[PDB]
């Protein structure tokens, strides 16, 4: 899972283009894209972690300079793909209709109180990932530690800037759904969660900034003592 | 930048467009999206969450020490207190800028960003220039991209969301405003301020 999208670190990727200001959807097909998220996530398609991953398999240069929304797309078509609920060649001729008639009309469809329900049920109460486990926590604050070098191919939230670096436990969090299982259609399988202080000389180096730290949060089994 | 590869940004929408409106017709079709859920999810994220939300917690934290220290523990528990919370929050982590540290917010995997006080990410958070850059050059780039000079002397401390947690900064109370009411002092909360790359308003 050392994907493109694994950027942090990443150099020559160019300035930041910032407008002065900007709506929340810049066209219609946004909110469409948008809305898809709570649908297909209620519909069973992907949770939160399969979603993604769904991404983080994109071809890496439509990636770095396709639409954020886009990457949504890309990642329902992956799991509605994968889940066969959506079958690629009726999607294929159907854009080609769509290409061809822009202004046809989508299909005859009935509304449904409770996806409203569900939508303000989401948005207002949560998606917790929180979770209790048995294991009491294996750290505490002050520990030091030293994040794996794994490099598994599937899903997991572990950039490659921090992999083999140590760290200092900064706050325990409690336990969450755990994402290499979780991304990889494994289950919640919850761990314990972490935030770590890292260094700006341990990540980048002798020339780094002194007066400069990383928080990042790490998963039980990301981290062992770096021995203290 | 340039990619001499790139179609126009009009024939990448025009390609886009199509694509969605197939894709929608399917899920459409499937009985689990319809016009009225789309158009729900579009109103809530364009008139109703915002930073606006944010802005309130940071002035009830300017003005009440003890709501301060509670948010500082629990950032979920706190915003609750005020009807803020939900989708993309549900474990909120505030930090606090001083004149010894200061704080600045980053997804680098994703997007991750803390919805129920802020909504959507703006564009360039999510892109990955930003992404790419604020962990390891995170002065140089507050001051080049937001005018920011952060001293070299003092700390600055990135947070990468990782995980579900979501963090969120608390921005120093600007100079010059004793005694001002919560609605001129929110006045001076922006979405960047709670993001780290900019601090409050002044004056
Ligand atoms: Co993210």
């Not at chain 1, 160019?14 to 894209?33: H, L, M, S, T």
């Not at chain 2, 197939?22 to 109703?48: C, F, H, K, P, V």
């Not at chain 2, 997007?111 to 959507?120: R, T």
Request: aromatic share 10%; hydrophobic share 35%.
């Amino acid at each position: 899972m050392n994907g493109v999208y694994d950027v942090g670190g990443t150099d020559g990727l160019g300035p930041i283009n910032r407008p002065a200001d900007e709506p929340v959807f810049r066209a219609e097909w946004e909110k469409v894209a948008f809305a898809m998220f709570p649908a297909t996530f209620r519909a069973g398609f992907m949770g939160l972690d399969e979603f993604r991953f769904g991404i983080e398999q994109m071809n890496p240069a439509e990636y770095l300079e396709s639409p954020y929304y886009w990457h949504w797309i890309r990642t329902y078509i992956h799991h509605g793909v994968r889940t066969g609920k959506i079958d690629l060649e009726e999607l294929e001729r159907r854009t080609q209709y769509y290409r061809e008639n822009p202004d046809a009309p989508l299909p005859e469809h009935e509304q449904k109180p409770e996806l409203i329900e569900f939508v303000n049920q989401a948005v207002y109460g949560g998606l917790p990932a929180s979770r209790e486990v048995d294991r009491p926590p294996k750290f505490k604050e002050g520990d030091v530690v030293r994040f794996s070098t794994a490099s598994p191919k599937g899903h997991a939230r572990r950039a490659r800037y921090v992999r083999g670096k140590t760290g200092t436990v900064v706050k325990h969090h409690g336990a969450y759904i755990y994402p290499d299982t979780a991304g990889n259609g494994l289950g919640e399988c919850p761990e314990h969660l972490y935030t770590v202080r890292f260094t700006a000389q341990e990540l980048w180096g002798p020339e780094g900034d002194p007066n400069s730290s990383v928080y990042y949060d790490c998963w039980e089994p990301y981290i062992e003592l770096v021995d203290t | 930048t340039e990619n001499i590869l790139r179609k126009s940004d009009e024939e990448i929408q025009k390609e886009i467009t199509a694509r969605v409106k197939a894709l929608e017709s399917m899920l459409i079709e499937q009985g689990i999206l319809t016009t009225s859920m789309i158009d729900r999810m579009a109103e809530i994220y364009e008139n109703e969450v915002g930073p606006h939300l944010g802005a309130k917690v940071v002035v009830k934290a300017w003005t009440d020490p003890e709501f301060k220290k509670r948010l500082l523990a629990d950032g979920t528990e706190a915003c609750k207190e005020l009807g803020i919370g939900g989708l993309q929050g549900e474990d909120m982590m505030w930090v606090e800028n001083t004149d010894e540290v200061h704080h600045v917010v980053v997804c680098t995997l994703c997007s991750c960003y803390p919805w129920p006080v802020l909504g959507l990410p703006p564009n360039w958070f999510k892109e990955p220039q930003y992404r790419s850059r604020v962990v390891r050059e995170p002065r140089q780039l507050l001051k080049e991209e937001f005018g920011f000079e952060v001293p070299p002397s003092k700390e600055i401390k990135v947070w990468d969301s990782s995980s579900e947690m979501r963090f969120v900064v608390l921005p120093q109370r600007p100079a010059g405003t004793d005694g001002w009411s919560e609605e001129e002092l929110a006045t001076l909360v922006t979405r960047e301020s709670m993001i780290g790359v900019e601090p409050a308003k002044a004056v």
